[PDB]
Design a protein around this nucleic acid. Structure first.
Lengths: 49, 48, 146, 153, 341, 195, 71, 48, 97
RNA sequence: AAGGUAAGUAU
């Protein structure tokens, strides 16, 4: 995860581990990158790409 | 003074020390029984 | 650098403002309606009233002798096949949901749902795939049919 | 509150169907003289949602005496008497052929206001003994009671 | 840069002509409707126990369907055929419209009584809101009927076929707090009753509104329980809705089989009804397979029950398919490929 | 985090002290279509805001006794007037007298008034409940059904929300925007999950 | 037996609705002796139910068999 | 804390009385001679 | 018992707490009654007024059951009084004591 | 100065 813990807050750390289970951060980054890829693919001729 | 409809004395009120100690002991009891107590319950006991 | 003017949103002070507005509106309605409501011998003796009643009784005895223009149909025009007729019913919507009434056939909607399910089981102007989430085949009736 | 006390000591309707080798059994339905009685127990859970729903009835289905009575009584239960009075006055204004709305307006209106409500009722709905008896009860004066009963007769 | 904790997005850097104007709403739409972002939102909501939708009430689903078969009195209120119109497609390409009389379904699965309230077309004259008026009229008729019946015949449950009628019934039954009105996720085939000729001709021929009492369990309670009668009737109605023409032919296997004038359904013996129900179930399964391009052999018993009932096995959307992949750990992930970066 | 009402996710704390809210905690930003706009609460460079003190919203005993005397005299006059008209007092008649008096005027409109009239010696019972129930009652001196609710706290909550910057100012400190909820209106909490 | 125990211990609509607390709807204190206590969505706006939920008779209080014998 | 007559207040040194559950609050009102006699009677038994 | 005692006025007004006032209200009334006495604040002729506040020490623990029962016969039925007094003569348990 | 160690398996 890209979350920085400024102190040992285990009450918060345990619940932050659940939210980003199954590599949610990586999946979000990958999905955003892919969506931008389709966006720029749809505009190949207009943007002279 | 009810009969003359005029002021004659002033009661200076003050919280008794026994009630002070009772409230302080209540707060101490709330704080001691807080190892497993949730924050909401502690604050509710405080508010009450 | 410099925040722009923002009005603090108080959820429960707004309720007090709403209650005060409602009370003021009710008082204004009462004042207006009392004007339309405040505009409105024989009252003290009985023998005269009975004489009048008998006179009126004598008087009564003497006198004894198709067009559905504008209604949207949430189906394509080509969905309807010539040679036969078929029934449309209103689509279910909440009463408080303020929206135009649309005409719907249950069988046609079942067919469209089956088509969509078949398409989704086989498919496995900007950002089209998620445009359906944020945001339909209907035609407007005119002078009856179209 | 009961005046004895001191410091220390409904969405009704009109139609009932008649339940009595034929597949078809039509049920002739009759009309209701009284739109129930003011005995609501305040069983409204969501007050604002019920207020919105009853408002839609008064618009989508006007000229329905229970619709105005129900909304007026719901406003009364929540403690907004004047809103209930205005609602029942509007109901009498646009549902003026039914005794129930007029006698509910008379119940809600305080003091001399109910007298004019009853006068408008008898002007629009004459020959109604229910309204005349209510006027007799409403009017405290014995001479004026006699006058009201006389006008009724 | 994306702020996941605050759902803020921005971009800094160089720009070529048209890159920024495109990428602005590109990023806006991505933030609004990303699948993985939706997964993060839903996980945060579930962890916070914060909800937006109106609290969910008990619904007649495919799970609690067995609980419906009790000894208490239940009613089935359907307002689908209240405002009803008929359109015909002419060969010239023009299509015509003619509104027709409607109906209100008040079905009692215990005794088989069907209280039909014919809604004449005169009530729709000069009415802007057709659906609201139809629902309010339906609720008023339901209340009138429940006031007509004595207390011991009053229902303990009023299941509504359509979601929109829950509020009108809820607010129009304020005098009956002890009567629970429920929705149904599954869509029961009570709208197909009017497909029967005896109801359609009666409603079309009607000139003024009137309350009509029927009996869909004409000669059934003399030989089977009301639990079996309800299931047989719901199967018949499902077959009629799915394929009206073939179902009629199935209901009369031979010209000898006849219907009495006071019975809607054919007078068949107890053993014949088994074959008739099997044939109707085969009809329903075959037509479901035709409409969904699936084989009836692979359908399991639960799937068959869902098909027969109104439960809808809707195919997940492309967005929902992506969400399931993100929400669940990779299936049997095999690191068969190595990448050097 | 402490003094936010529990409805917005806070602890619902009540304060009897002088607690300053730093001006750096009154700023929030929301993203619009054109861009991102920053907002702050308590503009014009005012001094640091203070959470309301509980004392300012509790009416003193002497003034409350004066108000009780006046209100009950007014109620006696209104009741005598209504007797002359053979009319029952309405809730609107006793409107300015609401939440005033010891006992409170709203106790007249309670639905348990008929059965509470036979409750005699209840104040000694409330004081003697300490010997039957293990829990300690901080309201041993009064009964809510008999004396009424002698304190109102909605004004205190309104002032606390106003001091904290309202919903926008409060919810910026929270994970509300992380849920991407379109608005805070139709939301509700669940004090315990199904598990 | 399992059905009856599920009916008894199971969550009830009156208790399901009392577990829900509205977001941003600051209610009023209804119990002096215990603060924080609230009815939640019971008889409050935003509950979404026009009519009040009825009392489930399966949760009614009953006495023990041996206690009934003693009585 | 009321009397039928003003003269009934002065009939006894005890003018006000209030018993709580177990606490007692008593307010006397002496003249010079009454206080002197009471003090003499007390000091007769308990000299200081 | 409380309903009947209030009905026939068993307890004089000085018995506290009273159902008609919270303890702060009776403190206020006590102060006003002190202020409303005749010549309460006069000391020209050497007159003095004294406030005594105390407790009945061991009030509950020293109540004799026989005397309490016999005094209760005076205000209630002999059967009710016997029930109330016999109720105080019960075994007190705490764990194994 | 702490009350702020993930427990690992591989290389």
């Amino acid at each position: 995860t890209g979350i920085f813990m400024h102190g040992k807050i285990p009450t918060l750390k345990i619940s932050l581990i659940q939210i980003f289970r199954a590599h949610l951060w990586q999946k979000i980054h990958e999905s955003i990158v892919m969506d931008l890829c389709q966006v720029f693919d749809q505009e190949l001729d207009a943007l002279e790409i | 003074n009810e009969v003359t409809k005029e002021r004659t004395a002033q009661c200076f009120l003050r919280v008794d020390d026994e009630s002070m100690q009772r409230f302080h002991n209540r707060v101490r009891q709330i704080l001691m029984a807080s190892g497993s107590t949730t924050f909401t319950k502690i604050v509710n006991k405080w508010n009450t | 650098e410099e925040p722009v003017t923002a009005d603090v949103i108080n959820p429960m002070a707004l309720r007090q403002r709403e209650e005060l507005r409602e009370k003021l509106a009710a008082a204004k309605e009462k004042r207006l309606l009392n004007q339309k409501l405040g505009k409105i011998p024989w009252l003290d003796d009985t023998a005269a009233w009975i004489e009048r009643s008998r006179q009126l009784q004598k008087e009564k005895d003497l006198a004894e002798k198709r067009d559905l223009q504008g209604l949207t149909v949430e189906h394509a025009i080509d969905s309807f096949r010539e040679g036969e007729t078929m029934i449309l019913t209103l689509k279910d919507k909440g009463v408080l949901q303020e929206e135009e009434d649309v005409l719907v056939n249950v069988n046609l909607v079942d067919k469209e749902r089956a088509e969509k399910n078949v398409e989704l089981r086989k498919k496995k102007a900007q950002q089209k795939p998620r445009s359906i989430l944020s945001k339909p085949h209907s035609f407007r009736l005119e002078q009856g049919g179209t | 509150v009961d005046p004895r006390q001191t410091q220390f000591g409904r969405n009704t309707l009109m139609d009932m169907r008649l339940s009595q080798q034929t597949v078809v059994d039509p049920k002739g339905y009759l009309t209701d003289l009284n739109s129930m009685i003011p005995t609501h127990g305040g069983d409204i859970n969501d007050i604002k949602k019920a207020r919105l729903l009853l408002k839609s009835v008064r618009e989508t289905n006007p000229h329905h005496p229970p619709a105005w009575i129900a909304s007026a009584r719901l406003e009364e239960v929540t403690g907004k008497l004047q809103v209930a009075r205005n609602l029942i006055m509007k109901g009498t204004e646009m549902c003026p052929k039914s005794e129930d709305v007029w006698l509910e307006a008379a119940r809600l209106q305080p003091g001399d206001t109910a007298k004019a409500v009853v006068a408008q009722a008898v002007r629009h709905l004459p020959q109604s003994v229910r309204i005349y008896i209510r006027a007799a009860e409403l009017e405290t004066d014995i001479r004026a009671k006699k006058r009201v009963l006389r006008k009724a007769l | 840069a994306i702020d996941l904790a605050y759902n803020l997005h921005s971009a800094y850097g160089n720009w070529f002509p048209g890159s920024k104007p495109l990428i602005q709403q590109a990023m806006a739409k991505i933030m609004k409707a990303n699948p993985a972002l939706y997964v993060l939102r839903e996980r945060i909501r579930k962890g916070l126990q914060l909800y937006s939708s109106e609290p969910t009430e008990p619904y007649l689903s495919s799970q609690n369907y067995g609980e419906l078969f009790s000894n208490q009195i239940i009613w089935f209120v359907d307002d689908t055929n209240v405002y009803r119109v008929t359109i015909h497609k002419t060969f010239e390409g023009n299509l015509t419209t003619k509104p027709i009389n409607g109906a209100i379904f008040i079905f009692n699965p215990r005794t088989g009584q069907l209280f039909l309230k014919i809604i004449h077309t005169s009530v729709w004259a000069g009415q802007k809101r057709l659906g609201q008026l139809a629902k309010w009229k339906t609720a008023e008729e339901v209340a009138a009927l429940i006031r007509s019946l004595p207390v011991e015949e009053q229902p303990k449950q009023i299941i509504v076929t359509r979601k929109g009628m829950l509020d009108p019934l809820e607010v129009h039954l304020l005098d009956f707090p002890n009567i629970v009105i429920k929705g149904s996720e599954l869509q029961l085939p009570f709208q197909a009753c009017l497909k029967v000729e005896k109801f359609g001709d009666l409603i079309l021929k009607a000139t003024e509104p009137q309350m009509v009492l029927f009996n869909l369990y004409d000669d059934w309670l003399k030989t089977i329980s009301s639990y079996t009668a309800f299931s047989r009737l719901i199967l018949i109605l499902r077959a009629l809705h799915v394929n009206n023409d073939r179902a009629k032919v199935i209901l009369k296997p031979d010209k000898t089989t006849i219907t009495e004038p006071h019975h809607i359904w054919p007078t068949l013996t107890d053993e014949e009804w088994i074959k008739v129900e099997v044939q109707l179930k085969d009809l329903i399964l075959a037509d479901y397979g035709k409409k969904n391009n699936v084989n009836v052999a692979s359908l399991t018993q639960s799937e068959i029950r869902d098909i027969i009932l109104g439960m809808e096995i809707s195919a997940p959307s492309q967005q929902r398919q992506q969400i399931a992949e993100i929400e669940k750990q990779t299936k049997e992930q095999s690191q068969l490929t190595a990448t050097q970066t | 985090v402490f003094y936010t009402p529990k409805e917005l996710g806070g602890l619902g704390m009540l304060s009897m002290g002088h607690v300053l809210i730093p001006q750096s905690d009154l700023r929030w930003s929301k993203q619009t279509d054109v861009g991102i706009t920053h907002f702050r609460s308590g503009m014009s460079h005012e001094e640091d805001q203070l959470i309301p003190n509980l004392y300012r919203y509790i009416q003193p005993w002497e003034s409350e006794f004066i108000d009780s005397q006046r209100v009950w005299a007014e109620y006696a006059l209104k009741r005598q007037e209504a007797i002359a008209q053979n009319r029952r007092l309405t809730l609107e008649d006793l409107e300015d007298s609401w939440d005033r008096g010891i006992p409170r005027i709203n106790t007249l409109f309670q639905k348990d008034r008929h059965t509470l009239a036979y409750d005699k010696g209840w104040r000694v019972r409330t004081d003697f409940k300490q010997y039957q129930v293990l829990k300690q009652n901080p309201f041993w001196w009064t009964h809510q059904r008999h004396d009424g609710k002698l304190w109102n706290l909605n004004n205190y909550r309104t002032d606390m929300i106003q001091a904290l910057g309202g919903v926008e100012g409060i919810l910026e400190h929270t994970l509300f925007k992380g849920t991407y909820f379109p608005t805070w209106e139709g939301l509700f909490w669940e004090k315990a999950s199904g598990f | 037996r399992y059905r009856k125990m599920k009916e008894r211990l199971g969550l009830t609509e009156i208790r399901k609705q009392a577990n829900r607390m509205s977001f941003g709807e600051i209610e009023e204190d209804a119990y002096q002796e215990d603060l924080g206590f609230s009815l939640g969505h019971l008889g409050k706006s935003g509950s979404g139910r026009v009519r009040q939920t009825q009392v489930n008779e399966a949760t009614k209080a009953r006495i023990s068999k041996t206690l009934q014998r003693t009585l | 804390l009321s009397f039928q007559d003003i003269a009934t207040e002065a009939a006894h040194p005890i003018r006000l009385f209030c018993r709580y559950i177990d606490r007692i609050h008593i307010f006397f009102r002496f003249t010079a001679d009454e206080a002197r006699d009471l003090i003499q009677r007390y000091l007769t038994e308990h000299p200081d | 018992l409380w309903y009947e005692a209030d009905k026939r006025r068993l307890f004089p007004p000085w018995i506290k707490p009273a159902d008609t006032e919270p303890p702060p209200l009776l403190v206020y009334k006590w102060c006003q009654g002190i202020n409303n006495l005749q010549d309460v604040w006069e000391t020209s002729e050497g007159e003095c007024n004294v406030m005594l506040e105390s407790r009945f020490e061991k009030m509950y623990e020293k109540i004799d059951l026989t005397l309490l029962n016999r005094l209760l016969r005076l205000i209630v039925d002999h059967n009710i009084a016997d029930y109330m007094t016999a109720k105080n003569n019960v075994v007190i348990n705490y764990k194994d004591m």
